[PDB]
Design a protein around this ligand. Structure first.
Ligand SMILES: [Mg+2]
Ligand SMILES: [Mg+2]
Ligand SMILES: [Mg+2]
Ligand SMILES: [Mg+2]
Lengths: 100, 206, 86, 151, 98, 127, 114
RNA sequence: AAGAACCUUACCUGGUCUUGACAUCCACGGAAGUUUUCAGAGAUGAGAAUGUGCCUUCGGGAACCGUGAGACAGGUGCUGC
RNA sequence: CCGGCCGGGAACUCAAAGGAGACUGCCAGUGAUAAACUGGAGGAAGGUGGGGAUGACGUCAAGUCAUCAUGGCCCUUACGACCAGGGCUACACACGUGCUACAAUGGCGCAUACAAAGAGAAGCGACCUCGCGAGAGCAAGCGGACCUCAUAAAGUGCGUCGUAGUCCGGAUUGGAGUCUGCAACUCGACUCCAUGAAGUCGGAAUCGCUAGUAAUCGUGGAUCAGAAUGCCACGGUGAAUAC
């Protein structure tokens, strides 16, 4: 599904985890109730200084096969149809045709 | 365009999974896509080598990959140097440390994948599909496969409209879950566009 | 109604408006940020906000501060509608 | 049912007494799958009409609904292009059930302060043959009788 | 004292696993507290069967992860030595806990 | 010096102990009348024992879990009827003549796909 | 009874009484009546004139009715004139909070004349 | 569509790029990496410090980055008749 | 410290493995004497016990080239690529599928019961403290039959409201906030206060359901930073009728 844009996505995951999760405290510590010093405001300003793609929220969490946005399952990582496909051909352990 | 995948419905009973290993929420996805990439690498690289199916398993952060193939000589190669090189690559993809087993299918003219890839080779070399699939069926009946259904769809020899043919011999009881039936399908990329071919073989009742 | 702590402006707009104030009013500003918030010092400025097709000049008055830039640059065009009586 | 005949169901007896037809009456009351509130309505209504009828409790209820309990009912068969109605003799099992259904509807249509009060007073006047329930029975009865010829 | 808690997908496989570990503790100087079935977790999935519309057609999937608890009481040194490296039976995940 | 039975109905499982001696009945350390005994289906729980002599002869210490009011009630019911193990063959015919021995399996039906409540569908329109 | 702008219904309990004045709902009327000590179940007819004389100043403490209606009008007027988006919609008779204008939201749009 | 604020996004306006964001091949160099300045809506563009790391053919390597040449790459573009 | 809390016990719930058990097996009647049918007993279950998966050959040139794969065909200093803003959320209207109602078998207030299933480590997040509340601070426990989400709601008792556009209804708007997120203007959810519209059971027409079903009550999950009145799933109460 347009490897242009799933290339965009591998880029944005790279950048995103290269900045936040570590330097994310710029909000995570400063922006909480504590010292109410102006320096904190300076901090949020430093939070717009950064590239927008840095934030994780921007991940659309695509398929790891076709890069398909919708129908994704984060337990497996594949869109619903390749879940079905691999499921029936036997590539995913434990999955069974369900009747309870 | 309705019938369920005959492996999938049957997989609980007589068909073990092609992947046997355990994982939790964390690593399930990553070793599953790594699984994908190792499988595509092998089946693409060995496409000529006639591999029947690939069953992989991951005991204790090590991966053991059993290759089921008709022509083991070429995948092992002279003095087994090639199996070593393959093992290096799949160590790279699957994560360290790779292992590999070569298992030989004693009668390749039975199992669905090998008959399928055969007649998709005949079919991509523009033999008449008719006696491609005839040749397949009579071949599987010679060994005494208790049943077979070979079906071919697609353009069929440049005919502008698609059409479907199939030949059923002996028992092929799809609704008997217990019944052991091998199934696969392989596409042929032909000058007129893809033409797919499915094969059901019925090896035994229990 | 949003942002419990800290009114929000994007730094490039607060700096452009800072050095715009200290230099005296001259020309409208070309900002694309609908996302920012009017501040007390911004009043009297004719700064043009992006409506998606072009920039519309809006003259900032102190009566509008707590609001944001966007809603004073209406994006969707409506017109009379089809209706245009029988 | 194209053919198969089914055995009906033993319905659990009312808690206070042993009358199954009363518990059935409860079932025709309840909406919203609520047995306990509508069953409370059954009781409250029954005892608040009891002493005023002068009979003790249940036999006032049978002597009550007996008057709204139809005898012949009219359905439509063998249409001649004008779709005429035929009278037929109603089952003994359907006559009291149909009765109870009619009375419950009667209570709901006109309205009053509470259903127990409403049910009770309308039933009390059903024992007299004032009620719209008994009137409903008679109009049904007239319609059956006016078309007896067809059988 | 120490409890190895083992979980798998197919129980067919898990049986002889817990069995050969319980008896490999038996012949290593027993005093084992026995296997317990505990509950098995059902992961459940409904995926839409077609590549494009007809939402009404869905497909069900289970993942039944079966677990067992063994909880051996007295850890003789040879027992704890025999319960490591002999855990075998590929496809199950056995968790040592002390 | 004790006798037992189980019984269960709709997701609620019962356990019932009957013994000779007094005639009092208790559910979860609390009296029957103040457990569920103030809500309709008053009769259902004591009626199997009413089918024969009730008097002061038999004590019931019973406990249950799961289900709602009536589910529990029936659970207990089936509980006694299979807890009358003493004289069971002699009271067996009476019980089956009047029922109670049947479990009455009859539990909720699964919601299916595309239909909202197990049998109901989303008002089909024809065009 | 006759406190604030109006308040003159009958057969009503105390909070239900005070909800008739514009700008006092159930909870803040309950605040009033818990503030001036009046019991809840008492209809205003049978309460003595003393604690209603307290009721008048107690409800006077909160801004109600007259000035409310005006301040509302002048807020809808402040947007309406200002040029704010929600003003624009107040002005055009559509919804403001962002509701669907496709199909519903004809409570403000009014029942169709065509 | 199992979940359009940005993303998603495939559409529109405007600012930009042309072997290209994405893959292999060649030539010519640099380690990668890290921090920081200005201009700008941001893309980007001009910079400045820092780092210089694992074979030993040492003329060569591994990975990543950078410029040019084409062979190509790319298209959620049309046709489910 | 009256909570299985601690010794203690493996009996029973419960869990999940392996088995038993129901097939016209037995009795009688009917039936071509056959297949089978009817009724009985035993039995937890009776003739397909209930439910699900499983969809023959083919039809609609049905759907999908926008998951993917693919032949042709077209664009190649642009139909390719990156970015900000806008837009998919517009609105005089018409339809479809739902939620909430129009009330007293009810609303509102206090008290009081009784579930199943499921999720969880960039997570669930208790106790305690602050705030009316959405929530905030602190921090334990838990890859979980242990810890958390988690007070089930209808129900039951008592008190009130008294047929009124009402103490029904909660749409609309104003003010003040909170949470997520670089960012809630276009265009989030939730809270508090105020405001309290249409609606008195619905025309022609039309739909689902044969029992734990309909109806009604809540609970969980996927997707997901946030964003369910949708979808999938679980249990509670629980009918009428089939001549
Ligand atoms: Mg592509
Ligand atoms: Mg997202
Ligand atoms: Mg299907
Ligand atoms: Mg639907």
């Amino acid at each position: 599904a347009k490897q242009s844009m799933k290339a965009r996505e591998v880029k944005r995951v790279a950048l995103a985890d290269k900045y936040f999760a570590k330097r994310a405290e710029l909000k995570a510590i400063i922006s909480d109730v504590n010292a109410s010093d102006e320096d904190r405001w300076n901090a949020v300003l430093k939070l717009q200084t950064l590239p927008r793609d840095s934030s994780p929220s921007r991940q659309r969490n695509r398929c790891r096969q076709t890069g398909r946005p919708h129908g994704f399952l984060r337990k497996f990582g594949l869109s619903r149809i390749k879940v079905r496909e691999a499921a029936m051909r036997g590539e995913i352990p434990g999955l069974k045709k369900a009747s309870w | 365009g309705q019938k369920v995948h005959p492996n999938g419905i049957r997989l609980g009973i007589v068909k073990p999974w092609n992947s046997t290993w355990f994982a939790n929420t964390k690593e399930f996805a990553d070793n599953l896509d790594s699984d994908f990439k190792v499988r595509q690498y092998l089946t693409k690289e060995l496409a000529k080598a006639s591999v029947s199916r690939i069953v992989i398993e991951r005991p204790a952060k090590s991966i053991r990959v059993t290759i089921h193939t008709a022509r083991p000589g070429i995948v092992i190669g002279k003095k087994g140097e090639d199996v070593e090189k393959l093992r290096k690559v799949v160590a790279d993809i699957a994560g360290v440390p790779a292992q590999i087993n070569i298992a030989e299918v004693r009668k390749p003219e039975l199992d669905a994948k090998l008959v399928a890839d055969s007649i998709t080779s005949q079919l991509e070399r523009r033999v008449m599909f008719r006696r491609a699939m005839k040749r397949a069926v009579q071949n599987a009946m010679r060994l005494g496969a208790k049943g077979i259904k070979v079906e071919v769809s697609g353009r069929l020899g440049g005919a502008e409209i698609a059409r479907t043919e199939w030949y059923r011999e002996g028992r092929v009881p799809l609704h008997t879950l217990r019944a052991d039936i091998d199934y696969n399908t392989s596409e042929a990329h032909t000058t007129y566009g893809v033409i797919g071919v499915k094969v059901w073989i019925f090896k035994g009742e229990i | 109604r949003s942002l419990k702590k800290g009114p929000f402006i994007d730094l490039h707009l607060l700096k452009k408006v800072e050095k715009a104030v200290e230099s005296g009013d001259k020309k409208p500003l070309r900002t694309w940020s609908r996302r920012s918030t009017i501040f007390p010092n911004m009043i009297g400025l004719t700064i043009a906000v992006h409506n998606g097709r072009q920039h519309v000049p809006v003259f900032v008055t102190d009566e509008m501060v707590g609001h944001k830039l966007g809603e004073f640059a209406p994006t969707r065009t409506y017109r009379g509608h089809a209706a245009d009586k029988k | 049912p194209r053919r198969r005949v089914i055995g009906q169901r033993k319905i659990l007896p009312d808690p206070k007494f042993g009358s199954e037809l009363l518990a059935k009456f409860v079932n025709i009351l309840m909406v919203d799958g609520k047995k306990s509130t509508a069953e409370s309505i059954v009781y409250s209504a029954l005892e608040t009409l009891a002493q005023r009828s002068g009979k003790s409790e249940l036999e006032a209820f049978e002597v009550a609904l007996e008057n709204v309990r139809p005898t012949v009912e009219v359905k439509s068969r063998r249409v001649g292009g004008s779709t005429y109605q035929v009278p037929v003799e109603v089952r003994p099992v359907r006559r009291n059930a149909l009765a109870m259904r009619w009375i419950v509807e009667a209570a709901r249509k006109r309205g009053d302060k509470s259903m127990a009060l409403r049910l009770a007073n309308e039933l009390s006047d059903a024992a007299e043959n004032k009620g719209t329930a008994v009137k409903k029975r008679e109009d049904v009865h007239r319609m059956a009788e006016a078309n007896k010829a067809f059988a | 004292r120490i409890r190895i808690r083992l979980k798998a997908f197919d129980h067919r496989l898990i049986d002889q696993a817990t069995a050969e570990i319980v008896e490999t503790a038996k012949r290593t100087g027993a005093q084992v507290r026995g296997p317990i079935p505990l509950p098995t977790r059902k992961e459940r999935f409904t995926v839409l069967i077609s590549p494009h519309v007809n939402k009404d057609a869905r497909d069900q999937y289970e993942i039944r992860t079966h677990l067992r608890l063994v909880d051996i009481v007295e850890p003789t040194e040879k027992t704890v030595d025999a319960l490591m490296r002999l855990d075998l039976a590929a496809g199950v995940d056995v968790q040592i806990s002390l | 010096n004790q006798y037992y039975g189980t019984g269960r109905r709709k997701s609620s499982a019962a356990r019932v102990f009957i013994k000779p001696g007094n005639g009092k009945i208790v559910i979860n350390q609390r009296s029957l009348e103040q457990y569920f005994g103030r809500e309709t289906a008053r009769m259902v729980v004591r009626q199997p024992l009413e089918l024969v002599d009730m008097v002061e002869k038999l004590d019931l210490y019973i406990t249950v879990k799961g289900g709602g009011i009536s589910g529990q009630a029936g659970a207990i019911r089936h509980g006694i009827t299979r807890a009358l193990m003493e004289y069971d063959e002699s009271l067996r015919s009476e019980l089956r003549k009047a029922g109670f021995v049947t479990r009455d399996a009859r539990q909720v039906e699964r919601k299916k796909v595309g239909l909202r409540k197990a049998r109901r569908r989303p008002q089909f329109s024809k065009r | 009874a006759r406190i604030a702008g109006i308040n003159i219904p009958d057969h009503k309990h105390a909070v239900i009484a005070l909800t008739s004045i514009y700008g006092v709902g159930k909870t803040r009327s309950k605040a009033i009546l818990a503030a001036a000590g009046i019991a809840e179940d008492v209809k205003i007819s049978e309460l003595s004139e003393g604690q209603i004389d307290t009721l008048r100043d107690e409800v006077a403490k909160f801004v109600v009715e007259g000035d409310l209606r005006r301040e509302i009008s002048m807020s809808i007027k402040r947007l309406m004139d200002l040029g704010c988006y929600r003003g624009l919609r107040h002005r055009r008779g559509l919804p403001v909070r962002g509701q669907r204008t496709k199909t519903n939201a004809r409570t403000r749009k009014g029942p169709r004349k065509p």
